[PDB]
Design an enzyme around this catalytic site. Sequence first.
Site, PDB file in Angstrom:
ATOM      1  CE1 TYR B 153      40.787  37.273  33.142  1.00  9.52           C
ATOM      2  CE2 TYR B 153      38.839  38.242  34.139  1.00  9.52           C
ATOM      3  CZ  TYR B 153      39.618  38.013  33.034  1.00  9.52           C
ATOM      4  OH  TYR B 153      39.223  38.535  31.820  1.00  9.52           O
ATOM      5  CE  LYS B 157      42.049  40.540  31.689  1.00 10.86           C
ATOM      6  NZ  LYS B 157      42.930  40.414  30.500  1.00 10.86           N
TER       7      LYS B 157
END
Lengths: 240, 231, 241, 239
Positions: B153, B157
């Site tokens: 993640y 991101k």
Amino acid sequence: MTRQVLVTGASKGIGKAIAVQLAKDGFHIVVHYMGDQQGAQNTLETIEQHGGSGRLIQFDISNREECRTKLEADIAEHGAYYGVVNNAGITRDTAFPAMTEEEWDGVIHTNLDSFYNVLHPCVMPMVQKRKGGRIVTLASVGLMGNRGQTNYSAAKAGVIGATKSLALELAKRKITVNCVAPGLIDTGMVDEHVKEHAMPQIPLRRMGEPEEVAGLVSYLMSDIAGYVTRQVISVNGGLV
Amino acid sequence: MTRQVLVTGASKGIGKAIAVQLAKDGFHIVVHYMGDQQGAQNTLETIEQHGGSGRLIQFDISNREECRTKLEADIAEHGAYYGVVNNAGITRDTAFPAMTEEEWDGVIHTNLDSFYNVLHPCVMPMVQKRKGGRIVTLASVSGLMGNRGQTNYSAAKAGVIGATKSLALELAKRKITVNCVAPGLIDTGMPQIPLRRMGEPEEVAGLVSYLMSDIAGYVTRQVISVNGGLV
Amino acid sequence: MTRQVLVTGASKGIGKAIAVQLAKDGFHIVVHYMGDQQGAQNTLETIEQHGGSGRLIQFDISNREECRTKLEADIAEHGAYYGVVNNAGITRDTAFPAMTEEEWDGVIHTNLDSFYNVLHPCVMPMVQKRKGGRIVTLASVSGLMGNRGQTNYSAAKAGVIGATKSLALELAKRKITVNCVAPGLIDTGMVDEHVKEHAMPQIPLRRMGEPEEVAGLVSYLMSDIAGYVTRQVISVNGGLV
Amino acid sequence: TRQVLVTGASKGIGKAIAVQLAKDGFHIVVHYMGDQQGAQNTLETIEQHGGSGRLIQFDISNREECRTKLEADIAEHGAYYGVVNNAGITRDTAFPAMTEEEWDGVIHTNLDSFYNVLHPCVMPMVQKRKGGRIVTLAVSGLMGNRGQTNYSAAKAGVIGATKSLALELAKRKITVNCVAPGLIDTGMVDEHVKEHAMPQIPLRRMGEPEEVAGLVSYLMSDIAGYVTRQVISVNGGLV
């Protein structure tokens, strides 16, 4: 009921635009000025003609004793501020080897010491009222350094660091503390060679307007911005 | 002269709150969803309850050809979006040594490849309307600082942040601002956070609202954090 | 005790310089290449001729299954690596509207998926050997601030940085440091000259960097005295940013 | 042939830096203010291990003392090749309770430092035309303080000054960088601080002064000539 916001340098340029916009937002603006009482009065009259409210205050930001005196009295009479906006001054390039003691000291003490001089009289009243609050500092433009500006870069970075540390300190009181870092703003008298100098570095290929800085301050001052703290936010057209 | 704003992941949580606030701001919201039609319908209902307006749209952000087909047909029918908010994204937290292929790829695909899949069909129609525009991507404090169990993640991101800054450079000459919003820990249904609470979905939407506003036209290439002071 | 260090993309430029310098530091270098076998053997021959040790390995960092098979076999035969330098990458520069599916996908899945494809076979063996270790990824100034025509490359390298920080947090207690090196514009030879002096005025040092200058920072991070440096992205870019 | 001034070299990080840079082969100017015992031992240790150096005394808060001592030292021995400007010790003070003197004193000691020590040194460095190295040292990254607005202001100011000076001296083959240590075991660390900080440190241990000195050693090295304008943290993953 009513929420008071002190805006330094609100007789001109960025400070004036901030004061006008925050008055539109509904805050009772304390329009601060150093010497230019006419300009501060103009700001207040603009505020009143657009339906808002405010009052003037005078002190010299580099005079710590005067700052304390005038702010403590204004506060004793009217109550603690809900918001404090601490605006910046101008810079003047000077290479470090050529730089004199006075250039270093003066830049450090006008641009960094104003953090203490203006905010120290204001913070504990704000805490004691226990209704939260807002503190917003402004950089001269701090994050990156610039040739000929070791003193102004030190001062601006200092303000950023003081701002962030104070954010950590006041978080538990629901007071947000943020820094706004404008790029090249057109305040009406800027050198042409300055425009010439930086316009190719600016992706949006234009100067910012004072109202564009004021919009960001208006956001930070708003209730929905209460989870934003410890930030330095740039309004610089993409310069950095 | 209506201004249309696409909001992905708008059937729930942060996406829903963004769709609602932007409709209140006066934008015509294109409420996107993939499978959660009920959520999307609830979002549009709330939009109309407040006096706003919008419409629904369905596609899988991970299916590039489906994204292009549905978005290009929508733009053909109604005209190009003035704003795009790229909000959809999942997590598959796990220790990296224990992480499976699916846990890595799904996070990269849904979080990062969606930058291309959603924005690529939308950019040139935005540019061609010659009325400026707004692109707001969603990242996370994880993308700024790293976080245990979130190699995938944090990678996706952080990648969104880098893509967003690049596109900001590319589109600035058309007066299209491109910025990224990095929320901290948001309550969508704790001693390391200075404000000592989780954020609210509306608190993310408020920052997206600011960025979508006309007075934010000089803010571009920024990643702005709404995170209680975490970083 | 001998410490093996994998260096991806070590047939040329920065990867070669890193491999040569780490061999000089005393590490046994696993010189990885995809297609450029002669360059990789050149690197190993340089290493050998200055009294170092190493061996070649071949795989495509885009191909996850090939990476896993080759790395698991090499580690089964020779033992876990002490260090991994994730250096190899590609660029497919394009303005975003003109960018194709394959230009976006190739860059993401070669530069960013590399993190999983190379490091997942390597981390648990390293951890299991309980000797500590080193992981150094290679990113770019492009991944710190973005660059025109590089939405894909900027995305992949920013993602590499975020993954690097998270893995640093996971492995810190294992006495494995995890860091990212972000070079500026490095003179790899045959570098396009229009690009070159287009970039010169942005670089305070008014020159490109040398591959050896990147290798020196990797060499520092690989050293034992750098065991308290982790979760960092360190730039060697002549002051560009 | 290459001299390096190390301020605060009587103890702790400064001593570690002086010792290591002397082992690297630089001639170390071991500065102290009041800790003459410690500086004497720093130089004696350097010399026992085969290195060379000399002592210098001044108060980094006294711009005049700094200028006179540094100008005199440079006049006799030639300009420094490297300058390492170390940081003082931090103190907790909530901003509302902070006094005029606590604020002004920290700015004056931890920020004005930059001018007082470096200004006498930069132009001589430039004039020698042999390149050079400047390294400033910021303790950063911790959470839960009772307030450090003044120390953090001074340290952020040092970082900004450093990056700007880097921009100015890039053309001269002088690199200018800042090293930001986490919690370092200088032997005087409060037990309470150790307890509160350790769970925030991924490495779950304080750093050693020699671990800071290794990074300063890297930056001082010839191969590090393309690293400039950087803040590099040696903090065990703290930030």
